[PDB]
Design a protein around this nucleic acid. Structure first.
Lengths: 178, 257, 148, 90, 52, 127
RNA sequence: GGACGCCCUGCGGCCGCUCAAAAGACCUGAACCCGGCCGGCCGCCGGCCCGCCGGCCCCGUCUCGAAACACGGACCGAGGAG
RNA sequence: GCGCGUGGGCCCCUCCUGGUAAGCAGGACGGGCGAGGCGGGACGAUCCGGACGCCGGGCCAGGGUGCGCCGCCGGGGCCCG
RNA sequence: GCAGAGGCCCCGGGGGCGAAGGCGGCGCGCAGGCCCCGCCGGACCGGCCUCUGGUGCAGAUCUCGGCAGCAGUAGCCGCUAC
């Protein structure tokens, strides 16, 4: 018998392949992996894992966030691994080159009117496979309503809202009401 | 069912199992009892129908139509299309009211072998399906789509031939067995009106075209990616262990002197 | 599908995932959310603050339409303006013929000031306005007007 | 799921499942209902061919502050409205 | 058994003995209010200042 | 009719794995079922208990699924399937299905002889 | 739906008859179980020419712990429980 | 993040407590059994070694080496198990 | 592995030149199991992909049906008798 239970702490689960039935997402993941194997560019190491992420892990990035993020770097091509969406709140979108997995129709029209080019992952692989003049941007993962309720509400230091309506005095009106 | 009879448990002291028993002492009212209810009776309150979003349903019929125009998918689906001269097949067929007229048009555009594959395939199926009004199974053949033409009477009794109007293209007809790839004989009117039916969807834009596996392969062989590719460091040599002292040649590698 | 369910993978295992020491038994902890202040008190305290008790005034009948208060932030007022009109309005600035938005027609009774408004002077009509709404609109040169 | 953080159900417990008034509506009759209602309309249309199937009904502001601006069909024209067009109720 | 502490220290050391996490050491919980107000006043000036 | 040379085929266990206590009771069939009793001598694999099915008994990947002749097996029901399935392989051999009638098994054998495809059940329905 | 002959005190039997076939009061005809005849002397696992050597407690079950002098189980087929 | 089982334990060491004691009733560091095959202590859920894919060769723990029953002889001392 | 549904099975899947089932013997798979051959049988039956579930039994003093050893055993002992 060998003691393999000491300084060894189990194995971790990391998604090495996209669970997406979509043929397109699998075609890009395999391509970006082939580039990563031949040239270990870290931009491609992240893109390969950003295509394997879940919908919840891959949050939406609006053209308003992208304008703020690319404020000092208009020349650089934003690379988003999710959906680019319009923000009706921003009246004027700046010209920007954005590459995404999907652009909303309202967003796509706005970027083109601005003079920016909406690229696609296949186009990015053809022009800049290693990721030169490109920034890997991400939306806010913990923006989901589900994330806000995670935790034990009713614990003193929890600071989280309860899941149901509840509507009663005990436990809510301060530490003393418990 | 199974709760019509009157059965109550005999109880302890009778040297019998406690299951509910009839006045005779015959076991009753149990899943394991002959003449007994099902443990969980089949119920009509099951949700037989599922729901699909209109966009997703429209996406599936658009993709099935695209698969029809791919020659490889149609042959893979098992249709005989070698004789057919172009995919998609569009024919200026006037109002055909006679099966014999329809057979002649289908012989002259090469669809005859598919019509004969389905005629010679009629068999009595296996299982209790026969008893359930599903006795005969035939292969699926070409799908006629028509607009402003009376082509239905001519092709209706042809075996394996199914007909549809361009306004109500049905997915089950387009993808038999969930497999897309239907040989579709379009009439000139039907094909011409296909771009008008898609406009009639008040607010639907056809999904935007994407790359194929072949396109991805071509990019992976393109000069830009090859220029980025860097050669890897040479691998390590594992070499299975041998006793060094066993031979002088073995000893030399570890100790040259 | 029944065929892809875990229950069909527990055939041959006897207890079926419920335990040899304590098997599946009919309602072991009681029916429903019972025992909330007694044996399940720990769960109600750790996850349900405010389940027990009475909190505030009770309206025997709430008028839902009377308590309907739809609201609009100053950031989205210009989106109500159609895109073709919006670009022209913004470019020309203009006080002689400034754009006029009646948020009540678009379905909103009160204006609020969450974001920022473009410099173009715009007349906004609503049944109520926040303090920030009025300040941000006035600074842009727009007029906060009430609507009958 | 099993307790932990869950929202309490507002589902009322089923009644008269085993016996009593049938409290289960089933909509297998919904496809056939559309055909039957259509057939009734087609027969009525034939009975009074020139006469339209629907009577003229007034435009009414939808009730409440929520629907004030919008208009909808109502039951009938007021006698004052039919005094303006110069008609009579009959 | 009314009470047993056996196995409890094997369970604790199986994946446990965990550090209290960072941001707990530098937490301002229980720090004097007057000091915290002074910190905020000092921070809101020049390079440290984060307002427009 | 002669396959690729191949290597020695080692079967880890010559005899079949039998269910525990299948011998004592007719009701217990010999088909292998995993012992799952609280006090099962076969679950505990005590000394002298019958051997337990394990992946370790698995045959070499190179000689797995290989018939004693040295050719793997392909099930044929019609002449088209022989022509398509046995497309110039020297690894696999044909075996006509039990259902195929004698009349058809002559025309399946003839095409096979022309294609030089070994048929394992050549002497079947022969009269 | 059983020709004829042969027999039987008779019962009934034997030959065969009809049929594609007895399929003969009825399609297929499993297991348990049993009678004839032939072969052995024997449970399971392993080794070998094969009756010797070695190993082997009765499962399911609650249980700290069951071969238990704990409980259920003669046998076999069908039905039988997220 | 979501959940399952569990919440009757028992035993060897070590210090324990009550009791005349107990294969008794309660504590406790660690380990074991539970849920660890296997060889040995004749037998033995826990003891001594050793913790298990399927095999072939070699080494050898613990326990032993008259015969059952695989494997031992040499030397010194005692000598009614 | 089971039972049904939608497809496929290049001249349109396998069948009275013998289907399913049953019985004996191989082979293949670590195994669930599969496959072939012979014999009985006498009309239906699948492989693959997608789909659906009243989908797999050794136990429940399990239900129902057969039926064993006990066993040619216990017994066939009232009212006088032929």
């Amino acid at each position: 018998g060998i003691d393999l239970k000491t300084g060894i702490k189990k194995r971790k689960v990391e998604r090495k392949e996209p669970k997406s039935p979509n043929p397109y997402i699998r075609l890009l993941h395999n391509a970006f992996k082939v580039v990563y194997e031949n040239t270990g560019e870290d931009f491609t190491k992240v893109l390969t894992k950003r295509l394997c992420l879940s919908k919840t892990n891959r949050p939406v990035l609006s053209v308003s966030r992208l304008a703020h993020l690319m404020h000092k770097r208009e020349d650089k091509i934003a690379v988003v691994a999710s959906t680019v969406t319009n923000d009706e709140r921003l009246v004027t979108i700046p010209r920007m080159t954005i590459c995404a997995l999907k652009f909303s129709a309202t967003a796509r029209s706005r970027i083109e009117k601005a003079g920016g080019r909406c690229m696609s992952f296949d186009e990015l692989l053809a022009e800049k496979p290693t990721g030169d003049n490109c920034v890997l941007l991400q939306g806010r993962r913990s923006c989901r309503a589900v994330c806000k309720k995670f935790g034990s509400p009713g614990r003193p230091n929890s600071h989280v809202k309860p899941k149901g309506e509840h509507k009663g005095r005990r436990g809510a009106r301060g530490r003393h009401s418990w | 069912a199974g709760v019509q009879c009157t059965a109550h448990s005999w109880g302890p002291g009778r040297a019998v199992a406690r299951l509910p028993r009839k006045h005779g002492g015959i076991g009753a009212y149990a899943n394991f009892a002959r003449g007994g209810h099902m443990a969980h009776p089949t119920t009509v309150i099951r949700r037989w129908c599922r729901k699909v979003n209109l966009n997703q349903r429209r996406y599936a019929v658009a993709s099935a139509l695209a698969a029809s125009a791919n020659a490889a998918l149609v042959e893979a689906r098992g249709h005989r299309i070698a004789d057919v001269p172009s995919i998609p097949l569009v024919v200026d067929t006037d109002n055909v009211t006679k099966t014999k007229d329809a057979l002649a048009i289908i012989k002259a555009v090469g669809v005859l072998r598919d019509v004969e594959r389905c005629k010679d395939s009629r068999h009595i199926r296996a299982g209790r399906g026969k008893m359930r009004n599903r006795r005969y199974i035939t292969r699926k053949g070409p799908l006629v789509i028509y607009n402003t033409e009376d082509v239905a009477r001519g092709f209706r009794n042809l075996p394996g031939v199914d007909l549809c109007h361009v306004s109500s293209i049905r997915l089950l007809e387009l993808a038999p067995g969930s497999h897309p790839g239907r040989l579709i004989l379009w009439t000139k009117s039907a094909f011409a009106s296909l771009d008008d039916v898609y406009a009639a969807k008040q607010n639907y834009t056809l999904p935007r075209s994407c790359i194929t596996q072949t396109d991805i392969e071509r990019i992976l062989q393109s000069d830009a990616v090859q220029k980025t590719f860097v050669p890897k460091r040479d691998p390590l040599v594992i070499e299975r262990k041998v006793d060094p002292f066993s031979s002088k040649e073995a000893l030399a590698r570890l100790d040259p002197s | 599908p029944t065929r892809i369910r875990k229950s069909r993978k527990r055939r041959g295992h006897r207890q079926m995932g419920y335990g040899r020491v304590g098997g599946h038994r009919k309602h072991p902890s009681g029916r429903g959310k019972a025992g909330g202040l007694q044996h399940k008190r720990t769960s109600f305290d750790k996850y349900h603050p405010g389940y027990f008790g009475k909190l505030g005034m009770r309206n025997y009948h709430v008028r839902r339409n009377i308590e309907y208060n739809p609201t609009i932030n100053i950031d989205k007022i210009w989106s109500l303006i159609p895109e073709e009109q919006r670009d022209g309005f913004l470019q020309r600035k203009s006080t002689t013929e400034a754009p006029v938005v009646d948020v009540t027609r678009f379905g909103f009774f009160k204006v609020l000031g969450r974001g920022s408004l473009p410099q173009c002077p715009i007349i906004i009509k609503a049944r109520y306005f926040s303090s920030d709404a009025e300040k941000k609109l006035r600074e842009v040169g727009g007029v906060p007007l009430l609507v009958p | 799921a099993m307790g932990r953080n869950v929202a309490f159900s507002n589902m009322r417990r089923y009644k008269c499942t085993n016996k009593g008034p049938n409290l289960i509506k089933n909509w297998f009759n919904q496809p056939a209902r559309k055909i039957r209602r259509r057939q009734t309309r087609l027969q009525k249309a034939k009975a009074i061919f020139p006469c339209p199937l629907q009577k003229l009904r007034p435009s009414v502001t939808r009730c409440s502050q929520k629907f004030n601006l919008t208009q909808r069909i109502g039951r009938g024209f007021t006698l004052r409205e039919l005094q303006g067009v110069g008609l009579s109720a009959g | 058994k009314n009470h047993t502490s056996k196995n409890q220290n094997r369970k604790d050391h199986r994946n446990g003995i965990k550090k209290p996490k960072k941001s707990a050491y530098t937490s301002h919980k229980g720090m004097c209010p007057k000091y915290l107000r002074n910190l905020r006043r000092s921070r809101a000036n020049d390079p440290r200042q984060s307002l427009r | 009719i002669h396959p690729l040379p191949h290597k020695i085929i080692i079967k880890k266990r010559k005899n079949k794995f039998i269910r525990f206590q299948s011998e004592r009771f007719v009701r217990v069939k010999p088909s292998w079922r995993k012992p799952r009793g609280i006090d099962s001598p076969m679950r505990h694999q005590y000394r002298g208990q019958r051997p337990m099915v394990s992946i370790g008994y698995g045959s070499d990947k190179e000689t797995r699924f290989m018939l004693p002749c040295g050719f793997f097996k392909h099930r044929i029901s019609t002449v088209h399937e022989l022509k398509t399935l046995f497309m110039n392989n020297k690894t696999h051999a044909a075996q006509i299905a039990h259902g195929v009638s004698a009349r058809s098994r002559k025309q399946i054998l003839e095409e096979a002889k022309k294609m030089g495809v070994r048929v394992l059940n050549a002497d079947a329905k022969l009269r």
